[PDB]
Design a protein around this ligand. Sequence first.
Ligand SMILES: [Zn+2]
Ligand SMILES: [Zn+2]
Length: 63
Amino acid sequence: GSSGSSGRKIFTNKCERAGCRQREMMKLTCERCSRNFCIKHRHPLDHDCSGEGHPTSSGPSSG
Ligand SMILES: [Zn+2]
Ligand SMILES: [Zn+2]
């Protein structure tokens, strides 16, 4: 039985911004978080950039 419908085509990109459905003909990835976004949210100032900002260091083993 048909379960789930996959969709992937090299035509347009999909912004990774919250409550955003902007499709930029060209691919736009941030330089800090390295995530896809729309020209509008392409800048790290018009989008909650969570790339190079949160301090992380190896500690726990589990995970
Ligand atoms: Zn966007
Ligand atoms: Zn970013």
